């Protein structure tokens, strides 16, 4: 299966968050680093099943503005349409 880890305390911008996802989810080099792009990768790229472990979520919200929650929402929406995703918020 695929495992992805986000260390929330190291996230200091919405760009850091997209770069971490790029690496952790083995995203294409063209990855657009936006919500449209992430959904595209979750639904037509990424390997399943996927375990997303999001540590220090609250700290990652501080320097991402609305970014962290918008991102989490896309993964929840992916899991709502059948993608096999386990999200661990610690």
């Amino acid at each position: 299966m695929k495992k992805a880890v986000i260390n929330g305390e190291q996230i200091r911008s919405i760009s850091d968050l997209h770069q971490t996802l790029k690496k952790e989810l083995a995203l294409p080099e063209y990855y657009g680093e936006n919500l449209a792009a992430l959904w595209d990768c979750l639904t037509g790229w990424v390997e399943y099943p996927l375990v997303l472990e999001w540590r220090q979520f609250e700290q990652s919200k501080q320097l991402t503005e609305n970014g962290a929650e918008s991102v989490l929402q896309v993964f929840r929406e992916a899991k709502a349409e059948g993608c096999d995703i386990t999200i661990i918020l610690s």
């Binding site: 294409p28 063209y30 990855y31 657009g32 680093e33 936006n34 449209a36 792009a37 595209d40």
Partner: peptide
């Protein structure tokens, strides 16, 4: 029927 494209992965 408005049509748009992107060539840079939705940027």
């Amino acid at each position: 029927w408005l049509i748009y494209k992107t060539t840079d992965h939705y940027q």
